[PDB]
């Protein structure tokens, strides 16, 4: 029992800047600081924007603020806490059946508005700041207009699918691939988030 160690916290290591006319990734913490912060759970870095890049000791992915909740995927964050200025913050939502988890949105972040447009012309934001057009094909599926290797989507779970007006339509969860080529994406619809809330 004295042998038992504790898993670290999820740590914000950067963000996807969507403020200006060009989307681009920004890193705010290096790996050494990330490991330190994951162990203590104390993150004093200023947080900005809607789409955060987050990391565990072993994985990196995305987290998206919608309606005051920072959402990400269970297969990335598990039940882990998230680092914050005051220490680790326990998850506010956990749903393994939806592959979804959520924490209170960090101070200084900006939240996306849940989409009510009903549009099927979507846009997926990746960890490399690519804005990929996606046609909605179902409640939780969308097809890439320009397919590409799954390598380009790896690490983007937790990122947003946006409507033409910039509302949040869903959280990126999985890729549908054929011969390593991503043709479609599975995602957590914002309505499912609003229900969980
Ligand atoms: C055939 C089943 C189908 O498709 C697929 O499963 N395809 C695969 C192709 C993988 C090849 C690479 C995929 C590329 C990008 C993918 C966007 C990202 C991503 O980027 N992750 S990541 O950031 O790199 C990472 C790992 C966090 C750090 N998601 C993934 O990799 C995702 C992880 C896992 O699926 C799930 N695991 C769980 C696990 C839970 O408890 C443990 C609970 C619920 C849960 N729910 C899931 C749907 C496999 N995953 C796929 O995407 C499911 C829905 C449509 C059909
Ligand atoms: Zn909308």
Q: Which CATH number fits the domain that encloses residue 7?
A: 2.40.10.120
Q: Active site residue: 49, 75, 121, 140, which one?
A: 75
Residues 131 and 84 in one domain: no
What experiment produced this structure? Answer: X-ray
Residues 125 and 76 in one domain: no
Reported structure resolution in angstroms: 2.0
| Residue 43 is a catalytic residue | no
Rounded Cα gap, residues 177 and 159, in angstroms: 18
Q: Which of 112, 128, 156 is the last residue before a domain boundary? A: 112
Rounded Cα gap, residues 122 and 47, in angstroms: 26
Domain that holds residue 189: 113-197
Residues 106 and 117 in one domain: no
Rounded Cα gap, residues 36 and 137, in angstroms: 42
Residue 5: strand, helix, or coil: coil
Residues 98 and 139 in one domain: no
Cβ atoms of 12 and 53 closer than 8 Å: yes
Cβ atoms of 177 and 170 closer than 8 Å: no
Residues 6+ apart with CB under 8 A from 135: 120, 121, 122, 142, 143, 145
Nearest to 56 by CA among 166, 158, 146: 158
Q: Do you know the residue count of the chain?
A: 197
Give CA torsion, residues 131, 177, 57, 130, to 10 deg. -10
Q: Which of 49, 80, 112 is the last residue before a domain boundary? A: 112
Around ion ligand 2, which residues have CB less than 5 A away? 115, 117, 163, 165, 167
Cβ atoms of 72 and 37 closer than 8 Å: no
| Residue 155 is a catalytic residue | yes
| CA nearest ligand 1 atom 37, residue | 75
Residues 67 and 161 in one domain: no
Number of domains in the chain: 2
Residues 81 and 142 in one domain: no
Residues 59 and 108 in one domain: yes
Residues 5 and 77 in one domain: yes
Task: Tell me the C-alpha to C-alpha distance, in Å, between residue 176 and each of 26, 34, 108, 158.
Answer: 28, 31, 34, 16
57 lines ligand 1 (CB under 6 A): no
Residues 103 and 163 in one domain: no
Residues 56 and 131 in one domain: no
What tokens does 191 get?
A: 């309505």
| Residue 8 is a catalytic residue | no
Rounded Cα gap, residues 112 and 67, in angstroms: 7
Task: Tell me the C-alpha to C-alpha distance, in Å, between residue 108 and each of 36, 45, 48, 72, 152.
Answer: 22, 10, 5, 18, 29
| Residue 99 is a catalytic residue | yes
Helix (H), strand (E) counts: the chain: 3, 13
Residues 15 and 74 in one domain: yes
Q: What is the CATH number of the domain that holds 176?
A: 2.40.10.10
Residues 5 and 86 in one domain: yes
Q: Is 128 annotated as a binding residue?
A: no
State the closest ligand 1 atom to the C-alpha of 174, by its place in the atom list counted from 1: 52
């Amino acid at each position: 029992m004295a042998s038992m160690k504790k898993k670290g916290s999820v740590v914000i290591v950067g963000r996807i800047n969507l403020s200006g006319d060009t989307a681009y990734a920004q890193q705010t913490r290096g790996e050494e600081g990330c490991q330190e912060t994951s162990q203590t759970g104390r993150d004093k870095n200023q947080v900005e924007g809607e789409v955060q890049i987050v990391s565990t000791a072993t994985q990196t992915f995305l987290a998206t603020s919608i309606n005051g909740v920072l959402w990400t995927v269970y297969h990335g964050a598990g039940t882990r806490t998230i680092a914050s200025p005051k220490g680790p913050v326990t998850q506010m939502y956990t749903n393994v059946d939806k592959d979804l988890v959520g924490w209170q949105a960090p101070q200084g972040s900006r939240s996306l508005t849940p989409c009510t447009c009903g549009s099927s012309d979507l846009y997926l934001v990746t960890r490399h700041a690519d804005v990929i057009p996606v046609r909605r094909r179902g409640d939780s599926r969308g097809s890439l207009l320009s397919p590409r290797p799954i390598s380009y989507l790896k690490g983007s779970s937790g990122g947003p699918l946006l409507c033409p007006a910039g509302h949040a339509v869903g959280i990126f969860r999985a890729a549908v691939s054929t011969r390593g080529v991503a043709k479609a994406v599975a995602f957590i619809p914002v309505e499912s988030l609003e229900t969980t809330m």
